[PDB]
Amino acid sequence: STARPRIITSKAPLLPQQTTPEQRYWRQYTSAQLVKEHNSVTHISFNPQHPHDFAVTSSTRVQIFSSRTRQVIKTFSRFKDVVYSASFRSDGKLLCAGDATGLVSVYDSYNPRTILLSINASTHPTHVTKFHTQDNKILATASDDRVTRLWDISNAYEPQLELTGATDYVRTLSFIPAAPHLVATGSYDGLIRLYDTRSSGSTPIYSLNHDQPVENVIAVSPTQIVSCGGNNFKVWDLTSNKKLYERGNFNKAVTCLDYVENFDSPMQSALIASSLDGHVKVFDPLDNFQVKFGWKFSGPVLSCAVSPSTAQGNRHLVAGLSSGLLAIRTKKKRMMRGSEYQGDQEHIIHNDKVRSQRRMRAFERNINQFKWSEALDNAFVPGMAKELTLTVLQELRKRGKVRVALYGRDESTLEPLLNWCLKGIEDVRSASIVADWVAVVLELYGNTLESSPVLQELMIDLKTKVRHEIHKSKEAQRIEGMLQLLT
Amino acid sequence: KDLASATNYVEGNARVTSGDNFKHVTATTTGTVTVILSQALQSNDHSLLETVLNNRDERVIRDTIFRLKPALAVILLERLAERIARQTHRQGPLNVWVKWCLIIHGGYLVSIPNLMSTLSSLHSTLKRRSDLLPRLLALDA
Amino acid sequence: QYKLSVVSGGKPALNNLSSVTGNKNIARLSQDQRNYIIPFNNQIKVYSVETRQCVKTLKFANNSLLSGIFLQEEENNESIVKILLGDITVPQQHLITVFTNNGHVIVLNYKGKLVESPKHFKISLADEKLANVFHSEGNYRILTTFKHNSLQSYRLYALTFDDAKKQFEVAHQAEWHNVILSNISSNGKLLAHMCKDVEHKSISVVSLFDDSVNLSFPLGSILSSQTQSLSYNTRYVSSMAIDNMGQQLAVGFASGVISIVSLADLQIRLLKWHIDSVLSLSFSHDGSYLLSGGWEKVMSLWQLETNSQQFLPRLNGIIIDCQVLGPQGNYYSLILQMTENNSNSDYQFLLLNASDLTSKLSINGPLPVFNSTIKHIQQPISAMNTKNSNSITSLNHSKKKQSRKLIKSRRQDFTTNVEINPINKNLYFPHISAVQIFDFYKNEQVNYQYLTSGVNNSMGKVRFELNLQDPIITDLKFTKDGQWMITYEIEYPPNDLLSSKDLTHILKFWTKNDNETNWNLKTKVINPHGISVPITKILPSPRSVNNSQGCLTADNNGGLKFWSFDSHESNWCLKKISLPNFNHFSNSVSLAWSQDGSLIFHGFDDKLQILDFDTFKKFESLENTKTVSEFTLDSEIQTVKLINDTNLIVATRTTLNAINLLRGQVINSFDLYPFVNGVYKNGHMDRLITCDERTGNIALVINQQLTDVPTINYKSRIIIFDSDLSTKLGNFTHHEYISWIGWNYDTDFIFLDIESTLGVVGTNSDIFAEQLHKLSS
Amino acid sequence: DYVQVADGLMVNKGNYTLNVITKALEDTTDTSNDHLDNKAYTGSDEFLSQYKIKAKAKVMSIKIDTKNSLVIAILQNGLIEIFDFKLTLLHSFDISYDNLKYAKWFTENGTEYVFVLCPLQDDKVCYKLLELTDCGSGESSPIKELSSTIIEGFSFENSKLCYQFGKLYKLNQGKIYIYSLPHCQLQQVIEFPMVDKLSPGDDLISFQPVSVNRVLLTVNNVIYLLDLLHCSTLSQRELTHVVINSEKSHNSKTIAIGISTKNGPNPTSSLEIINIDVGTNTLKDSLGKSFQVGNNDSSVILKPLFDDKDINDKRVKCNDVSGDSSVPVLHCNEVIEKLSALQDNDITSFDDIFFKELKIKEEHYTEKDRYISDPGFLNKVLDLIFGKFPKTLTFLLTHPLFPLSRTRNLLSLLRDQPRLFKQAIVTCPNLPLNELLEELFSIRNRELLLDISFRILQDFTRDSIKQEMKKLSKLDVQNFIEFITSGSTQLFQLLSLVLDSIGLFSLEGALLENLTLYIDKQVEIAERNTELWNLIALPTYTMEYLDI
RNA sequence: UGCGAAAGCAGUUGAAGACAAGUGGCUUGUCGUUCGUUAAAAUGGCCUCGUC
């Protein structure tokens, strides 16, 4: 003996925009929940050590959401002006928020009733603050006093390091993720700088010039960093000290970046960017930073962030727009005692239990039970789909006989064949099967066409559909001709 | 499985491919809208792409394609090819679009040294559309 | 110092008569039901049922007392006809006795190593006869065929051996004149034959040992009036069987009914399920279970006390003979035929225990795909004439037509396609929509896999649907690192429908690891090189371009395409393309590829083109010193070959040329016209003749003899050369027709017969322990 | 093996500078460099030595010393450095390494020992040599390669006591003993016209093959297994063959026997001392396409033999292949003698030409498969039939059907005899694309132009056709499409191709609209006759009548 | 049936015998009949091992 061959479903052949696995994995992000906020959602950060929380930065009101239920769980509203930068320490325990009054405050997580300490920065709005990645207790704050500073939170009274050397509107910081003594900054004249923290820290050891005023500087490796300003993002490498990639597939200036490594995906590394245009686009740092997928939202997206590498639950993409709301696109990952014994100590184990197959279709068991006319009739029920109907038509063509499947019909049951065939003749992959099926039905039912008046209008508008389709295919043949000219 | 049985054929995850498709080797013009198509072809925004593609006036299409920069018309009719591969019910009202780019700009993409490698999707779609003529003539007969 | 050596086995070679026997199965079980003794055309296999290995072989080319009997050149009509287990010389105390079709009774040394001298006797009264044996406790009978309308006669003799220790002696009980169908009771105490004695054709049942049952009647009594006036295929008795006792006969008619009749009062019983003709049927050991099987591949066993069935749905082949063979009926024999190739009569033996109907030891012959019939290889009987079977009225007609065509016409190539797997050195056979992996060391088959979207095993083929044609496999190549089957096949839409005027060409890639013994599909190139367009020639690459992972296919047009697998894309796709539209279209394309990785020898018909790889176009001339990139020979070339970078070996439609590439002129030439004129199809000589790495190449001389008028027998010669036609260092003649030869990558060659054998072109404690082992048994 | 000829310690150095290479004393005193001659002043050197030495970078210049201290000289700033004694005789083969790595402590009489270059770091002297005939530098191990015409052969390395291929090999008086690119072989020159790549594993060469270029000055090509070999009595250098990523045009090879040159690479713009001119800048040598293109030292007379099988035993094993017995047409010397008999004084008559074809292997006057075909015989009989007799039918209908013509199709534009022109255009299997396109653009406008249309798109390649018809006249295609307008599949396909190849904007309007009218009636009749091709109850009361 | 290209090319088609039916002969049909030419129709459709 043998088994039974499963009735295949011949899907769509090589149409363009083919389904690549990276766009499959990003395509399965569903349920785009849209949450209103009060003002422009400037900054969004995530929780490092338990990637289950993310912090959003509205005007005067910093919220933190959880990834399990995607509702607001805590607020932070002891801010005397608009609040700008929200960041987490790497042990996930304390939230640093830089506001516009300059008194940059650090709370701890889930306890807004206790401000841990208030760093007095300059009179200028402290526009970005973030903790160090390697060390915990050093905190980088850049205000628009054309300067940035490193504070030790233990010795919170004084600036531990005073990083000057930037001209106009210092705006982003990132630390080189292997050597902790290398701190990279960005300003609004371009000229992405970086400094050694052991040095005096008053001039960059080497600067890198994005010609546009740089908008975000992140690190994806110890070797290469990614800086963006204007309508293109440029990858620089520190070892070659040189720009080596630039993609400009946007309209307006790209406004935020981030990176994710080693997470559960066919695409290993992924750098996604928000672009102030309505699009957030993912780029693949493996093969020369090509674009891979892009989500469109209903206004200029001002920041975006994805869930980190080890999220362990519902993985998130989030993007705060400047219009006043926020987009979350998520993906989600005593008598019967012996009857679980499962054979531990026993000598010889025998196993031939057949797995239950998935449930066969109605037309599949009809063709397998050889009732061919019933297979055709249960095939042309409007509860079925296009590829299923095409495959049962292909099956009856290839194996049985369409003459046999039509040998006992009448005026009535010959209608839904032609009624499907009207929609089926127009598209590409069906029209040959439509052609020979309506050809053999008009071969076999000519005298009933003479008697019965009902399907005559079906034959008439099938003639019109054939004329419409021969006109369309003739002009497409003309386009094939003129491409043969242009080659 | 029994030890005297021909193993059943399996489709699995086979990409069915057609061999015809391959991989690689005062102003006084008109006031109508094509720089929307230019910066809707910079990015990929299907909403305003369908807003600029659901017109049908031929002279308007002429002046828009004429004002269009030629360097991105190749990916213009690439994405028109994927639109007409997705559905062929309104084939003509942008078959006019996929021909007028050729008519207005031909020599630039002729002088482009790799035509069929990056236009291999569109003429594959059109030969898929046009290779079934004889039996539909038989249908009509 | 070369030699030819027969290595591997062929078809099982049953009693392939034209309905002269209803017991078309001569395999046997030993009386200790653990060993299956099965004859071949080339071997005598003995298998063990609990392990399913060849527990011993009796080859024919290894001893000189039956290789002189049946291994000669022309008169090899000596064939084994029955394997008795009860020995004849001194009875009752573990050897087998072969009865042959002329009567050379041999007794052969079953358990353990055989001796060079087995017991022989050519039987006494044989002019040209032996049908089968019948045996009992001592009393043995023989059935013999005899001399009109060409219906043989049966004479029944009684046999014994003793008192004169060389010669048997016979007794001549009784005879009958015309037989068209006869079957034996499964225990052997009864037979029943037909007579055709007008007032119509008649049935008779005769007991052979005693005379307890003997009767005869016209079969118009068995026929109803529903068949008294209608078509002939319900008057056509197709098969018959008897119970063990002698009171329940069964006929199976060609429409498909099975009339059971009694034998006491000649009253009938209608077992009616077979839609097509009934080929195999047999009672069980008591008379309660009619076990049958017909054209569709089901095994149907009918309990008669309710007329209800148990069904085995698919046996990958139609059934010819099946009966119970256990001590009480715990094993079902089956002789299935696999009719989806109309070329050869390639049976497949299997028996299977009745417990859960699981199979046991499917012994099958090797399965080539010849392009023509071979020698009286007609299809079995169905109700309708078709392209996979032939009906009742077209059997002697098609037999005369096939014999006369093979006598008269001049198209006697019928060479098959193969491959050798480079990893595990076993050879793949294309079948119809199927590959069959045969390893010639143990001369067996490891598995069998369908490759297409075929209805070969979904349904069973039937009366009208046998005109449907399964999608045949044209050609598969291996990426010679043993990592990818590149398999190209064609599929056929059925006729009387407007899509019958084309045929769809599908190419597809198949991968495996060495764990799995069956391949899994990777990518399905439907319609390559255009649409409704053939490919016929196809090449993998040697290790240059992608470490033997570049598949480049030719065209029927003359075009070329080059596909190769990449890393960023984990799917096989293409790189290069060239379509010249030669408005003449010859199928005799060919391809060679330079193993350095430089150029492609495109052997289009009388246009041998050189193609450089970097532009996938014709070879460009820069130095202008003998920069010829196109040869034009005398006739249309068919085979191009390259042993190393110096020399090209191109056989055309008439002759053969041997060229230096480094200096583009003819080095040698051998005309071939007195052997090949148009006897080969245009494109099959490349499958015939082949390469090596260093030991030269092989041509294959074809010869069909001329009786003192041509005949159907055969001899064929190979001639081995060395390094662009220096010497004919080896000439060899085999006594049966060769089909192909090919370098199996262990540095020799393997050819194949049509009497399908394979061959290689080769270079007091001890006494107490013994008494205890004797007495404990 | 060989390839085409052209041009009608520098292997461990850097060129394009003033101290580019180590120029020898080619009709000079001691030493120089190449500047196309920097500070390379020797010391106590050149007793009779016209050669030189260096340490590969002009950081420590060396000499062909008569005191054997080739360690330091005027090297970088023109002042000497610390010099150590290495050899004791004429030290041309004493170009050491940089600093205490190796030093070929050699002489002009077979002396060898262990030495160094910067310091006096030495080892055990285990030379054991005789009056040799080869003393070079080898890098299998760091070794002095010593071979002889009397008794010596090895690469002797005094750094691990390594005799590579140790034998008493017997060489001869030669001059082109090159190395190889593989490093496991030195291309030995066993005579003037006899050289072979002697592999220094066990003193064995591949094969001593004869060549057209006798080995007079040979060096190793830096790409692959190849020797650039030139002859002293000639001006060309044959690049014979048997590291290839970068092309072998560097200063590694030193073989120059061209137009008065001496021991230089392909960039020979500084030859000896006076910076003489250069030749052909050589490319690399990787593929087998060049080997299939050209190779020297060809063969014996290699005319086709058409040998059958032997006279074996096949008496009762008859086959009856084609239509008759096994005796086919087999005559070559008789065919050549019949060609001479036809070219003799009976040439002018046609009866003695028909009987000449009868005395030759006579077919049924029109067919192939009578395999008597050689190209030289073919072209000589084509000359003797197409001098001035085309007046006979038997030989000229036997011979349109032979493809071994060797581009004698220039007469197809010249002669036009009608049935002979038809057999020419449908039969002769080497046709020129330009000649066929000009015959097409000639305006006879009939079925013979239809037949050459079928011939051109049965033979040629579409892109070559469009390239060859791009460079032609628009008046011919205008009259062509005028003929298409006035009055077929192959004509339609070349119509497609000429409408492709006429251009994009260089067209008229009027004849294009005449073609528009012709093609609209053509598509109308086309769809109408494809339509032709694919065109190939009980009433309750009635009134009847019966009979009587 | 032969060639060939997946399209098309050239050409078969009889002689005898047996048996049956229908009207002693005579008309019609089948061939487990011979020679020669390369030349639809019996109500009959494919198993269990998801089970508590």
Which residue from B minimizes the CA distance to D536? B141
- What's the CA gap between A286 and B83, in Å, rounded? 29
- What's the CA gap between C294 and C296, in Å, rounded? 6
Q: Which single residue has its CA nearest the C1' atom of nucleotide E51? A: A356
- What's the CA gap between A404 and A421, in Å, rounded? 19
Closest CA to C725 of C622, C621, C651: C651
Nearest by CB to residue C498, choosing from B2, B22, B135, is B135
Report the SS3 class of residue C95: coil
Distance A160 CA to E43 C1' (A): 100
Q: Which nucleotide is nearest to C409 (CA to C1')?
A: E38
Report the SS3 class of residue C618: strand
Nearest by CB to residue A14, choosing from B18, B46, B140, is B18
The beta strand positions in C25-66, using DSSP E, are 28-29, 35-39, 43-48, 54-59
Query: Is D500 close to A485, i.e. CB distance below 8 A?
Result: yes
Query: Is C499 close to A397, i.e. CB distance below 8 A?
Result: yes
Query: Is C521 close to B11, i.e. CB distance below 8 A?
Result: yes
A-C Cβ pairs (cutoff 8 Å, strict): 46
Distance C149 CA to E21 C1' (A): 24
Q: In the structure encoding, which two tokens stand for residue C300, read together?
A: 């149907």
Closest chain D C-alpha to C73 CA, distance in angstroms: 13
Q: In a 10 Å sphere around its CB, with 0-12 CB exposed, 13-18 middle and 19+ buried, how is residue A35 labelled? A: middle
Structural Rg of chain C based on CA atoms: 29
Distance C600 CA to E25 C1' (A): 82
Q: At what angle do helices D510-535 and B133-140 cross, to 10 degrees?
A: 60
Closest chain B C-alpha to D535 CA, distance in angstroms: 6
Q: Report which DSSP code applies to A235.
A: E
D537 touches chain A (CB under 8 A): yes
Query: Is A1 close to C314, i.e. CB distance below 8 A?
Result: yes
Query: Is A440 close to C314, i.e. CB distance below 8 A?
Result: no
Closest CA to C248 of C238, C257, C240, C256: C240
Element (H, E) at B15: strand B15-18
A485 touches chain D (CB under 8 A): yes
In angstroms, the Cα distances linking A348 to A343, A345, A351, A404 are 9, 9, 10, 53
Structural Rg of chain D based on CA atoms: 38
C501 touches chain A (CB under 8 A): no
Q: Which residues of B touch C574 (CB under 8 A)?
A: 19, 22-23
Distance C238 CA to E39 C1' (A): 30
Q: In the structure encoding, which two tokens stand for residue D437, read together?
A: 């396109």
Closest chain D C-alpha to B54 CA, distance in angstroms: 31
C477 touches chain B (CB under 8 A): no
Q: Which single residue has its CA nearest the C1' atom of nucleotide E38? A: C409
Which residue from D minimizes the CA distance to A483? D500
Closest CA to B84 of A385, C530, A427: A427
Question: If phi over 0 gives left and psi between -120 and 50 gives alpha, with beta otherwise, what is residue A118?
Answer: beta
The beta strand positions in A176-289, using DSSP E, are 182-187, 190-196, 216-219, 224-229, 232-237, 242-247, 256-260, 270-274, 279-284
Q: Name the A residues in 15-44 with CB < 8 Å from any D CB.
A: none
Q: In the structure encoding, which two tokens stand for residue C213, read together?
A: 């049952």
Q: Which sign, positive or negative, has the C-alpha torsion A190, A192, A198, A203?
A: negative
- What's the CA gap between C182 and C154, in Å, rounded? 10
C446 touches chain B (CB under 8 A): no
Report the SS3 class of residue C523: strand
For C651-708, give the DSSP string.
Answer: EESSEEEEEESSS-SEEEEEE-TTT-SSSS-TT-HHHHSB--SSS--EEEEEE--B--
Closest CA to D488 of D522, D461, D512: D522
- What's the CA gap between D143 and D439, in Å, rounded? 70
Rounded to 10 degrees, what is the CA torsion of C3, C9, C15, C18?
A: -80
Query: Is B127 close to A480, i.e. CB distance below 8 A?
Result: yes
- What's the CA gap between C652 and C661, in Å, rounded? 17
Distance A486 CA to E4 C1' (A): 36
Q: Which nucleotide is nearest to C232 (CA to C1')?
A: E30
Which residue from D minimizes the CA distance to B139? D534
C494 touches chain A (CB under 8 A): yes
Q: Which sign, positive or negative, has the C-alpha torsion D211, D213, D219, D224?
A: negative
8 Å CB contact between D6 and D301: no
Question: If phi over 0 gives left and psi between -120 and 50 gives alpha, with beta otherwise, what is residue C329?
Answer: left
Q: Which nucleotide is nearest to C395 (CA to C1')?
A: E32
Q: Which nucleotide is nearest to C682 (CA to C1')?
A: E4
Nearest by CB to residue C350, choosing from B4, B9, B131, is B4
Closest CA to C633 of C669, C600, C598: C669
* Start-to-end C-alpha separation, chain D: 109
- What's the CA gap between A372 and C464, in Å, rounded? 15
- What's the CA gap between C729 and C721, in Å, rounded? 6
8 Å CB contact between A266 and A21: yes
Q: Which single residue has its CA nearest the C1' atom of nucleotide E2? A: C409
8 Å CB contact between B98 and A479: yes
**Strand E nucleotides with an atom less than 7 Å from a protein beta carbon:** 1-7, 19-20, 30-50
Distance C449 CA to E51 C1' (A): 33
Q: Which nucleotide is nearest to C225 (CA to C1')?
A: E42
Q: Name the D residues in 484-523 with CB < 8 Å from any A CB.
A: 496, 499-500
CA D43-D46-D47 angle, to 5 degrees, is 120
Query: Is D534 close to B141, i.e. CB distance below 8 A?
Result: yes
**Residues written for chain A:** 487
Query: Is B19 close to C451, i.e. CB distance below 8 A?
Result: no
For C531-598, give the DSSP string.
Answer: SS-----EE---TTTTSS-EEEE--SSS-EEEEE--SSS-S-EEEEEE----SS--S---EEE-TTSS
* Start-to-end C-alpha separation, chain B: 51
Closest chain C C-alpha to D178 CA, distance in angstroms: 25
Q: Which nucleotide is nearest to A368 (CA to C1')?
A: E46
